[PDB]
Each structure stands twice: as C-alpha cells, then as structure tokens.
Amino acid sequence: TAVADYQKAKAEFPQKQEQYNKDFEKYQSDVKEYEAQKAAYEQYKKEVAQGLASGRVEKAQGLVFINEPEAKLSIEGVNQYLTKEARQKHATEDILQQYNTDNYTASDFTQANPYDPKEDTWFKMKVGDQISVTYDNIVNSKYNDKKISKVKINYTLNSSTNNEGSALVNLFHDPTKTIFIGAQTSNAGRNDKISVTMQIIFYDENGNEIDLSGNNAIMSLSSLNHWTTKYGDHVEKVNLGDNEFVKIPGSSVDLHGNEIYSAKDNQYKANGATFNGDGADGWDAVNADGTPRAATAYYGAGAMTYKGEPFTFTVGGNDQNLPTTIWFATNSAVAVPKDPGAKPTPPEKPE
Ligand SMILES: OC[C@H]1O[C@@H](O)[C@H](O)[C@@H](O)[C@@H]1O
Ligand SMILES: OC[C@H]1O[C@@H](O)[C@H](O)[C@@H](O)[C@@H]1O
Ligand SMILES: [Ca+2]
C-alpha cells in the first residue's frame, strides 16, 4: 500500500510537472489577459460613473435593436440572386471558398428572387448599385420608447476585392445580423477592398421614420479584426461619416481620421494582440445568431452614436487568392468591457 502509493506518485510525477508547466504558462497568460480586462472594465465603470464620452454606451442608449428573429425581407435593387441550387452546392464549402466569387458563374444567379421573404437571402451585389432592404415583422425593438415597426437599410457596394465589381452577400432576414459579404481577392498587393456604404432607417408604429437627433441610438461596430499574417494584412474599417465614434475602453479600435479600426494586429497574441481572436474562447467568437461568445469582444469593438446618416465599412488587405469576407453587423449590442472576475491564481506546484 505504501509501495503502491509511492510508485504511483513517482510514476505520475513527470506528467504532473508537465501539466504544472502547461498550467503555469496558462496562468501567466491568463494574468496578462485578466489585467487588461480589469483595466478596461475599471475604465469603463469610471466613464459610466463620471459621465465621460464612453459612458454614453450605458447612459445615452435609447435604442433596443438586438434580436429580430421573425423579421422578413423586402429587397429592391438586387438583380442577381444566388440560386438555391448554387447556395446548396456551396453550403458544405468552407467559409472562404463559399465567398470565393471565382467559384460561381452566371448560371448560379437569377434575376428573380428565389428566397422567401422570411429567410436569409443570397445575392451578388454590384459596385455602385444601391439596394434597399426593408425588414418588417419587428417585434423586440424600440428607440426612446417608440416601438420600431420596420427597418430599412440601404446598402451600396463601393468596391470589391475581385475584378468583377461584385461581391457575394448573405443578407440575414434579421437586420440586427446585417450582412455577410465576401469576394475573391483577385489581385496581389493588398490594396483592394470590399466597401459597403449603408444607412439604416427605423420606422415607428405609424410608419414614420424615427428622428435619431436625440443621439440615443448607440450602435455596435464590433469585430473589427485586423490580422497580419503571411496571407494578408487584413483590416476591417468603418468610416462613420457624420455619425459619432464612441470609443470602447481597452479596445484595439480607435479613430484614425474619420475611420475606426485597429491600427495594429488585434487577432493574434503572437502579433502583439492582447487577446487571441480565434477559437471558441477567442475574443471574436460568436454564436450562429452573431452574438459574441466572449467577454473580451470589446477588444475588437467600437461603437457609434448613430445619427441616421450613411456610414461605410471596408475590409481588405488579403493576399491574392484568399477571399475577403466580413460579417458586418451593427445593432444595439455594444461590446463593452465586462467584469473579469477573480484574478487567476497560480496552479499548485506538485511536490
Ligand atoms: O462586426 C459585425 C459582427 O461580426 C460578427 O462576428 C458578429 O455578428 C458580431 O461580433 C459583430 O457585431
Ligand atoms: O475572426 C473571425 C472574423 O472574420 C472576419 O473575416 C470577419 O470580419 C469577422 O466579422 C469575423 O469577425
Ligand atoms: Ca469581423
């Protein structure tokens, strides 16, 4: 028994030290992350408490526009819907290949919408051609206690990364999930981009457009990834136009001119990021509904006071042949720093 115990402890000890080593490196990593989250949270709590500009996220928010799972689509200005057959044919493909516009041909598109208003719709957008999407059956949303009955979003593709002046769009029937857009990156040199200008109009129950001049419509501009690898210097940017930037404390995202983005890589700790974006517990992890999985989502986020005026998102920087994609969603779910909990404690040294 003493022998059994002894030989087991001896035999297991190498493994226990291996695991200890792993757990300690994790602890050291976790503490840097914890300190960062804690710093961001404390600054956020201060800004809310003291009424600094970033506190407007909690103090000025009159918009509730986060979950509209019953919304249905009415679309004007789209000429090239993806056929159901083509959608089906690409549904098993990896996301990048799904948005590789080189893998679609003209026979994959039709001028007649095959999608029910109640379902996510796929189409090719064309550079310069504004589309107008009306979303109604809006059940959960309001602005300053005006129930929202309908939302209209205009979208305009300004440029693409492909050489066809086009991008493939998955348009969510839920307007709070917005748009998933992508195209092949046809050219080398990382200087092409997908750029979409949008404008969102909310309507009240009487069908009138809602005046946002009370500056209570705080909208998320989350998941502005910037990664830099051998495969690209991929940067997601928003030009806020006449809307106002709301800085998220601790965020990698800041104002550079009238564009917001992360000036440095915010995707890989290996590239200097505070948090990794990738994986099920990376800062950029999302549910199918687009809702962040991660308390650290603030890190790749900004926000805006949305004044009802156009804004433009852009993504670009991929190397040639790596399709450029962005799920761009804006809604009232601003990603702010959250309570990181207890400081992680070092693991017990096995002895
Ligand atoms: O930035 C747009 C969106 O990108 C997606 O990853 C998710 O739906 C959100 O985290 C974000 O709001
Ligand atoms: O890390 C995953 C990310 O991929 C990017 O290409 C898209 O912009 C994001 O919306 C998503 O946030
Ligand atoms: Ca993103």
Task: Compose a concise summary of this entry.
Helices cover 18% and strands 29% of the residues. It is an alpha+beta fold and 351 residues long.
Account of the protein in words:
Keywords: Cell wall, Coiled coil, Peptidoglycan-anchor, Secreted, Signal. This is Glucan-binding protein C. It comes from Streptococcus mutans. The protein is α+β, with helices and mostly antiparallel strands. About 20% of the residues lie in helices and about 30% in strands. The chain is globular and about 80 Å long. One beta-D-glucopyranose binds near residues 220, 222, 290 and 328.
SSE diagram, text form:
Layout: H1 2-50, H2 56-59, E1 63-64, E2 72-76, E3 81-82, H3 84-90, H4 95-98, E4 109-110, E5 121-126, E6 131-136, E7 142-143, E8 146-147, E9 150-159, E10 166-171, E11 179-183, E12 193-203, E13 218-221, E14 226-229, E15 232-239, E16 244-246, E17 253-256, E18 259-262, E19 302-305, E20 311-318, E21 324-328
Antiparallel strand pairs: 1-7, 2-6, 3-4, 5-10, 6-9, 7-8, 9-12, 10-11, 11-21, 12-20, 13-19, 14-15, 15-18, 15-20, 16-19, 17-18
Protein name: Glucan-binding protein C
Keywords: Cell wall, Coiled coil, Peptidoglycan-anchor, Secreted, Signal
Coiled coil: 17-44
